[model samples]
Target chain A: MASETFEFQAEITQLMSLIINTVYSNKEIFLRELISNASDALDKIRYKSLSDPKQLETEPDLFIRITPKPEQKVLEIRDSGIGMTKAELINNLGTIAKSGTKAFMEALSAGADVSMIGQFGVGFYSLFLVADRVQVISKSNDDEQYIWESNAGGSFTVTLDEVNERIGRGTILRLFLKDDQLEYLEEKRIKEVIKRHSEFVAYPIQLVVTKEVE
Target chain B: MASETFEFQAEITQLMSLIINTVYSNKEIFLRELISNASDALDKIRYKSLSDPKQLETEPDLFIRITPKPEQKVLEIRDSGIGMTKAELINNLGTIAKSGTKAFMEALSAGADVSMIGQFGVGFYSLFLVADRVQVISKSNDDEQYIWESNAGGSFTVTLDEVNERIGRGTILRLFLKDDQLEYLEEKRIKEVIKRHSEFVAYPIQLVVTKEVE
Candidate 1:
């Protein structure tokens, strides 16, 4: 499996700058956004199974799992659902073409509209608010497994996965937490964020902590 | 001036149809969406004024005023922010380009992802979750005042405002409530929605019930 790199659109670059700087007041909201995206992926697979029973015959229960690896400084949110094809991954994750960034920025510079955090469909970019890098591994029934890696900077790379075919038919987001964002690796803070914004989400969210403190 | 009618982008029509049928659970979230939009507009103008002090020389106070007229079954959210020009009105209100409708509908059909209310930047369409029709009156310094009207189902109209130049440099959203959604016209309900979702907004949000109760 080979890899390919792509540049974000101009609008995405501008929007990215805003999300990292001005969009959110609470950095914890990054978890909520990823959880929401994971939930959406699960919803897709669930819907597809209705018309074709075989869709879910392979995988039974649909759930989101959050696991923290403090030793590696990594936090992962995994889901079992209809995964994205490479095209869907690129289109969905690469850029947000409709970002009204020009208007949003003008508003931000005036010291107003600071709450436009989730306004431009750049919720995924919120990860940069806390994590310095993110890696997404997805397996969809329509296509082969792939890996998306980005440092939340100017460019991102996507590669076909030849190893670790673990994800059956869904997506997993691995966050390389910043030194200061280590608090999110704690099960307590993870639960707090999910409860605050995604408690009533229509799916079951499970938390798994792999490392015990010394 | 004569009015010009335009059809919503194909994706918007599809997105609108979905919102009316399956999107939001809390119908009053319409107020929160509009308030957020208004806040963004205000932020734009506020930012502009820093470089050009004359932008707010006429309208000193920047606030969002909610005027509910039960007699007319109408609720209006007015803001002293940077208003939209005709082009901006069309681009901003006429269509939602980022609607991940293809994926969203696949999830919706499976009886899942109902929490996608604001996922695709279609928060404005949430108005259809409550109201049957919506009218936007805006005045931008760069362009003439314009009126944008839409009935949640099909096409919308954008016309130059030759009458009632009430807003100086801002925008107003007037919602014609469906009979069952009349509760939104009550000051109590309006306050509830604001408190629940937008309590921490950067700008002031005021509610005014224009008509007396029976």
Candidate 2:
């Protein structure tokens, strides 16, 4: 497999500009949005597997893993859910195909609280609020493993991974944090955000912490 | 002015077809979506008014009114919030501008629970799940009063309301329920739905229940 880079749609570029520049009162909402998306993806596969069990034949039990690497200033959120195909990835991330941008901007610019989340498809882009770069490695039953990368500046890229399998049949999002936003790389912060926004989510959200033992 | 009819976009037609045919377990979710939208609209104007207070000089307080006319088989959810212009009406309701249809279908076809709600710009189409027809009359500070009506079948109509002064600076959604969906028109059910989903929605959601007293 090889790699390719693509430019985002015009609206996406405009929306990302607003999202990256907008000073959100609750910066931790980025994690909640990602977790909610992971949960929704998990729900999709579970519901589909009810009719055809093959959807989950690769990975049955669903869960989300949050790993923070302080050394690298990276936060990884991995989920064993229905991953996206090449087209889905492009449509979902590269474009604001939904009428959410204007409405989302209407709410965001209005200074609405993070409590007013969801109902907007652009939640994925909220990562740029904290991260300088985001890498999404996804593998679906419908497609091979693909990596989608973005710096949240102007454009993004998608490529087929010929390297080792990073995930079985799901998505692993690695958010490379900005120097000032490195606070999110702490496990305690991740756990608190999850408990506040997604504690009632159907799937289990586990935080994998690594510490140096004396 | 006499009312006119408008057609929905092609994608909306497909999404509405799915919504009308699919049996959602949480039928009362239509109210939640409407209320959430209403709340968002209120938040928009409130936030905008901070800079320009004249935006609310005509209508200062923000609130949502739920009027269930059982005799007419209509459920009206009105909000004293930021309304929509003619273009916004066409863009917001006439089209499912977000990339939610494909994702929504993926989950619904797989029989995911209504827990899969939100994150989709098509929440408005959920009206078709319970109503035979849905009408939106909105007046924005930027534009005149516009009416958008849909039969939940093929297309919708958007036109300028030149005759009646329906509202000031807000939106009014009238849901003409199907025979089986009349349960939602009851005052008790409306209150319960509001309490469950929108109890803490920032703005007050008042139910206007009419009764005869001797």
Candidate 3:
């Protein structure tokens, strides 16, 4: 099938820019949002699998993987969680979902378990703080593979990935980091971010560490 | 009426000692507990006064007072919150009130507005970290002025005061600080503690500053 490009609504574009600019302390927040989203997707599939085990087709184990490729200036966060269908992707990514605002606010209680911290669209949009180009590759149980790409611009494209079906069921976010945001390519920085924010997440989160040979 | 000396149950005494010893970094916690207790009292009286106007006779204005008497080595935290009756004191102070345990645990969420940090029994007991001798002088709307004194030992005494009726309403905690804990008697230390723990409290908190005439 042909690639389809869609423009975000005028208000959506404004809201998206608002988060990117206002989140100046953005490093402290981006990884948290990604991991939390990954965690939530994992939770959703686990719950659905209880009702219909077929949802666990081949990927029974749910986890998140962080891979930073310094050479390519790319950082990939992959989750073996609930994947989104083509329509679901359009709906979930296209709309400004705000279900967790109150929960996020309440999460500020002194001792609350704040694993779920960021708001819906805001958390997802916060990645623009680091990434000039963002690619979301998803494979849902109900639908075929699809890739959504955006550069924090006016429009994003969703393409059917019939050939490259590496992900059996889940979503993978690949971020093309801005030059200054290359610090995210470091393993220690990623580990530190994970430890601070998603230390107590239910599913395991693994970071890819490539050691150099002497 | 005769002064009654009630010994805390065997387990209660052990638990009290547990907090006092285990709380080694105790200074940071004592003032928080006292102020939190004060704030809770203020909230209770305000709620009660909504129905019965008698609850706010001369003391219509709700506030908290932190008075540090350096010369006497006493730190007094008083609140125009809800004062406990003799029976209420025995029940509230005697038994381990565990209602706020869940709330206290939830308060640990990162960035939570934790003015309501610390548990009921734990918060009150934490004061023993600084106070060698703790005297609670309270006057409830329904009852006369009463004094409850404890040394974090096996027993605490509650006595009815017939002579000096100074308190209009609510409770006052007069702490006889230990030699090492005399830092609590300093105005600067008190200010810092109040700022950290009770800065966002609903009621106005006043620190009585006794300026030295040079």
Best by TM-score: 2
Which residue segments of model 1 deviate by more than 4 Å?
A1-214, B99-115, B211-214
Measured with DockQ on alpha carbons, how good is candidate 3?
0.00
Per-residue CA lDDT of model 3 for B94-206, tens digit only, reads 65445654444444334333333364344786677777788888888878778888887898889886432256688989889888889877667777776775657777777
iRMSD for every model: 27.4, 29.0, 33.5
**Stretches of candidate 3 exceeding 4 Å from the true structure:** A95-117, A162-165, B1-214
The 0-to-1 C-alpha lDDT of every candidate, in the order given, reads 0.74, 0.77, 0.72
lDDT of 2 at A74: 85
What's the DockQ for every one of the candidates? 0.01, 0.01, 0.00
Error of 2 at B48 (Å): 63
lDDT tens per residue, model 1, B122-185: 5777888888788898888888778899986568889877543256678888889888889887
Worst 10 residues of 1 chain B by lDDT: B205-214
Which of the numbered candidates is closest to the native, going by highest lDDT?
Answer: 2
- RMSD (CA, Å), candidate 3 to true, equals 26.8
Model 2, runs deviating above 4 Å: A114-117, B1-214
Cα deviation of A65, candidate 1, in Å: 59
Write the number of the candidate with greater lDDT, choosing between 1 and 3: 1
Docking class of 2: incorrect
